[PDB]
Amino acid sequence: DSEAVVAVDAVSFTLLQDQLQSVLDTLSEREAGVVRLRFGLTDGQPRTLDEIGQVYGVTRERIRQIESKTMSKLRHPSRSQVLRDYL
Amino acid sequence: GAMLDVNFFDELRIGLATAEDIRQWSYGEVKKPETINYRTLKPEKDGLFCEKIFGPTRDWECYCGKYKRVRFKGIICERCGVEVTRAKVRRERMGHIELAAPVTHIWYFKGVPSRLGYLLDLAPKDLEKIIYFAAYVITSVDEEMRHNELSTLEAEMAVERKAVEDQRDGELEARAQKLEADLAELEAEGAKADARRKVRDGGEREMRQIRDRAQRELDRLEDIWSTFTKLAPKQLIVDENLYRELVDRYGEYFTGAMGAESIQKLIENFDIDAEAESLRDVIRNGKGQKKLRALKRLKVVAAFQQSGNSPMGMVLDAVPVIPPELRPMVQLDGGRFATSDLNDLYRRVINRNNRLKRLIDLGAPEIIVNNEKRMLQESVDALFDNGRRGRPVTGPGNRPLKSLSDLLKGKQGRFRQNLLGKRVDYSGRSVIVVGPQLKLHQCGLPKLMALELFKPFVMKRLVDLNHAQNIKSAKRMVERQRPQVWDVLEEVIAEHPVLLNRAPTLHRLGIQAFEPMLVEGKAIQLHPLVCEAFNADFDGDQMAVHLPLSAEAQAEARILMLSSNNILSPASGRPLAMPRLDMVTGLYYLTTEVPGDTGEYQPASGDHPETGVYSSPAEAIMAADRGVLSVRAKIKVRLTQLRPPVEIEAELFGHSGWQPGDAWMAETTLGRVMFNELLPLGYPFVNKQMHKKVQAAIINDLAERYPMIVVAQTVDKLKDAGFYWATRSGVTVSMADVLVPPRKKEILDHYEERADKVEKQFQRGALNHDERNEALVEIWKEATDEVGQALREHYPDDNPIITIVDSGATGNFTQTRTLAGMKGLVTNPKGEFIPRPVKSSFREGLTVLEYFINTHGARKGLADTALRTADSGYLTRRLVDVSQDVIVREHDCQTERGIVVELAERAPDGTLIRDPYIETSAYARTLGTDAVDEAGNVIVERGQDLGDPEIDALLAAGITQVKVRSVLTCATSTGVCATCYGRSMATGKLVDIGEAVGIVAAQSIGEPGTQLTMRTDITGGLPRVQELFEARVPRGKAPIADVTGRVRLEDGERFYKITIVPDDGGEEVVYDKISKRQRLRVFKRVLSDGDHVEVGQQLMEGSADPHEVLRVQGPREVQIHLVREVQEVYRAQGVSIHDKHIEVIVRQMLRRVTIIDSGSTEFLPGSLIDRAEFEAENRRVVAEGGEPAAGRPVLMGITKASLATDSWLSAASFQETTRVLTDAAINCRSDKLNGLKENVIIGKLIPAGTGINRYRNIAVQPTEEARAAA
Amino acid sequence: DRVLRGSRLGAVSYETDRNHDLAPRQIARYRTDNGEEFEVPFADDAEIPGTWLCRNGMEGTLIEGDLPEPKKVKPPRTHWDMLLERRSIEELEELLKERLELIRSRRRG
DNA sequence: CGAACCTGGTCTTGACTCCATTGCCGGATTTGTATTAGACTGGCAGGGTTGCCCCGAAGCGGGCG
DNA sequence: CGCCCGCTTCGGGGCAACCCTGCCAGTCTAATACAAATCCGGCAATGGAGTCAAGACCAGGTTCG
Ligand SMILES: [Mg+2]
Ligand SMILES: [Zn+2]
Ligand SMILES: [Zn+2]
């Protein structure tokens, strides 16, 4: 039955969620909130740039610059050496 | 009740489901015989896989994709119609079909009692004609319309028959007219006088056949009129033309149909109350055959009347559909598909239902619609049980299809294959080798297998030690097997018990728990002492390794099932960690004594002192390391740390003979000193020759008197010294060490001369063939014993063969006699003895014909072993299921009843000669009464363990009979108490309050059934035991007496006759059919004529019937006869079972009593009910109007006893799954989940051992003083 | 010539099983002819159809008084239609008069 | 001593790009139903195997109204 | 007088152990005519979502006259 649960990748997924929580919480509040709303972590549907600019009281261009700067931040080896083995 | 199954259950009620329940379970009606679209592989709409009916295939997705995530959950897509949810509801939602015409359920039509036939009082031959469109049935009729149209229609009938007779005499008149015409054209011209009457005879025969036709239709009209007068409901009408004539003449006055609709009409017009009251009247007043038939009917009629059930659910108006995930259409790799064999039956039912609906709406003649309805009926019957009625439905390749009942029946069902025994995870399997350096509680383990057993433990541990960043690289590190994972594996292995299985598991000691340790290679190393308990040699046997996970299972394997805690056996109480083959030979060589060896004790004078004494065993060991002392010479050492025996203790030290600084001289060998150093400090000096029975007695005493850890360490030391002295013993086999007797040829010639004399006398016709065969058999048996005697006296004592035999290591003297000497007589394919016998030994080499003669018995025994092993497995399976609900519940039932024990019967000269079977009939029990003698003091009081010192005290004080307490007379409600069961065999103390003594007793009885030989008209092996526990009437049925008095013997023609004269005013009891192959009973001499016999005296010779011996002597003697007869079979092979293992099964036999009077409370005459439930119902009925239901105790076999239990789940899981389940659903029997097998099925915690409420609810807290110290 | 690895035709995802919020939804009450009531929870913004195929197995209508009148199709083919496509009214009337005269001659002659 | 500066961001405005997303529309393919007028009229078909036991039903000897 | 109850015989259903090891079975009147349904290939309405260039600008480290 190939459609069953492999039962080691599920607990690896749980530990991946906790590790990603730690890595995202090592940053500030605006960055982690914009990232989680952008990629849809607290909810199923990912909020778009206009939605996050609405919920943050700004324009979408500031949201996009924040997104670009945080994605430039997260590719550091200090924030990548723990997440590299999860793919 | 519950529907989400929170594992909080107390009942499981089965019931006969109606159409209103069926269309309440179902979610949507399936109406098309399609499964899957052939091109896009999606489930079709309204098919057998429809996503609107059974739920969605994709997680949180509708069919048209309009709602595709969790935020739309619990809603229904307004276009497609699939409720959006998880995809696992395709395993739990059911559908249904709405049939165009009703259909009879096959379980209530075709059984061994047909329940529809017993309910409606119809013959099954008639029922198959009704419900399969073969014969009409009158479902209703009028009374008053028939009453007055009786007169008017008999006037109509007389009018019609008058017109019939008018046409008849009109034919007569036309015959007379044509006859006169023949007269005019015959008797006026020239013709033959016979030819002129040929036309007269032709007209006469024409009138005869005309009145023949008229009389036949007269018979037809009389038949239809008489049948219309005697019309009644439930009457079958075969002969279609008669029914059509009756209908189109008398369309009033009655209705009559054909098929399941007519059966449904009969069940409609039905009252159970007046029917059951008429049946009660018939069983009250009737007699003979009609009383038995009315009882068999009253069973099912009262079953339908008592509960809140309706009989209308035996017909079926709506079939339900099983969910599709239990009959999946899985595709393989590469597009190949696999159905599940129920889709074809469901598709056939769907096809024929749609075609019947179209035929009815189209308007078709009766032939096509009737054939279509019988086709639909046959299809539904084939769906429920293929192969029940008529030919089974075969698929491709002539294989019968797997119907719904075939998922349950037999060995491949859900019960015996997937519910009771499942494949488990965290497991392993490998071959075993002998590991003689391990301690007793250890086991070897290959690291390549323990790395896969302990994978998540080692994953967590090497994540914790920073050898990997996370679990993923740790798993890849385990898969690549990097050189640090072993260093982690030792830490995660240490102090973690594992279970080691061996298949087949005969008894309780087939699973023991060891401590593993890492061992190179790939073989599970085993301790050489658990081989006897496992019954495993090293010829390539494999053993499966399991693994506990939680703390409860780890403590269970550490405490309950550890290998160093099970030394004794639960069957007989003898040790099963005793020294086996090589250890026995080593200790026998180490402790034997040779007269005149190197450096003995010779008491000398003149030349020197004795030169045999020593200061200490250290000096003895130094003088044996130098070549002066042999180990087995009689020396006189002075010992300091070995405790002397009782004689020398009371002689030298008297009372305080504590050793470890004292000194005393001891004339022994060196070897017995080295042996007694193995045994502990408190043990007295043994000073014997260690035969295997002496080692059995030593370990038995040492395990009865000392703690268990001392016994385990002593057994380990004994294994070490036994192996080390087994190498140096010098037991080897060479063909110069197999000596032959010197006088073999003279003995063979002397017996050959007598064989020649017998053959010559047969040649001279003085005796027939059978007598000369018996004479030759006797002569050569005598010759075989003579050659064995001469061979026994020829050998020395230090021959390796005779040392291996006489030291009790292995083998017996018949094998040495066949090695050297004479093979003897060989059996036949039938079992006779060929009078040839083989005179060559296996050392001299046999010849061709002697080898070919030997092969008969060899192949016969080798086939019989495997057949008997399968039979013994079946018997153990029956006994475990029967005795499964006998567990200890209290500490003391406080009864005063108890059986007696013979216990060393009186010698006629006058002593107390000991009975041989005291170890298997009186040890380890509790004294039910006191024991006193000569109006003196009590020797053993009430309630003692009754071990060996108390037995010796009783025998020395000179009493013989005691009343002992046992589980036949235990007065607890559910299961036995604890003092009735007495001492447990495996521990040595009193049995606990949670033991499963029933399964222990069943395993201890059915384990050694493989070793039970058989013989060359009474059964004397395993089928004798099987006919005892099943309580059949035996083959050699010997009658017994029924009264005291003398006999009237008669030697009749080819069979005897025996009549017993009573000592009272009764008729003399006659026993007629007693064949001449039976012989008379011998007692004290053989039976004479006029001999005064007792009540329960066996008249003939053979096997008495247990059913009769219960009726004559009551339930006490039937316990004695059944226990003695089973023990007499098992002790023939030298196998000891304690009698408390047999009394458990006998107690489960004699539970229920029969009903011979109903009383006035709900008890049918002939229904077997429990002794507790029936006697409590007498308590309820002595009040509120007093009459007792009269009952007499019955004895029933084990298949008959286990099926009539209180749970329909344990009974259906045992045997005959259909016939148990079908009448459980009639009576609406509700299980209570109270036994032992049902908790195994539904997966809750069993009520035995550590599962009961005494032990499961223990509060564990630190004490208050240790709380303050932290 | 491969390994027996099966898969049911469908995927299994795993997302957050949260019940604290869902989409808002209505409940429509459908009624069949034989006195049955059924509840089908549609979403809020959903064009509720006037008819529905019920769980019982029969086409139930909606309990609000919509009265859609769907104007169903004709019954497909009759034996009368297959007779009329190959015969005419006067010929069928002629055979009717033929059988009428035959039953008259059988009845009274 | 003050003062430019230079650069973290913080944020907005405005233009640009680009790809989903329905919507017709025209045609392609896919699927379902109706209709064929000389005469034709009750199946091929495949095996029968054990042993033991229990029990329920058919049928026959034997008396009875 | 035919009618019906004890015996006997015949037949149907159930069971007959337990560990590995295994990986897929068949076939014969054949077309037209049409219509409805579904799909698919290709622009055409966007229009929103994102991308980029530039800049307005708040104000704290950083380096000169
Ligand atoms: Mg073996
Ligand atoms: Zn949908
Ligand atoms: Zn008791």
XYZ file of N, CA and C and ligand atoms in Angstrom, chain B residues 893 970-971 977 980, ligand 3:
16
model
N -12.305 -19.933 48.934
C -13.750 -20.056 48.822
C -14.408 -20.465 50.130
N -14.674 -26.466 44.012
C -14.507 -25.067 44.382
C -15.826 -24.328 44.247
N -16.214 -23.618 45.301
C -17.527 -22.999 45.378
C -17.489 -21.505 45.104
N -11.129 -20.690 43.106
C -10.473 -19.892 44.125
C -9.009 -20.305 44.187
N -8.228 -23.962 46.581
C -8.654 -25.179 45.902
C -7.644 -25.593 44.848
Zn -12.647 -23.166 45.973
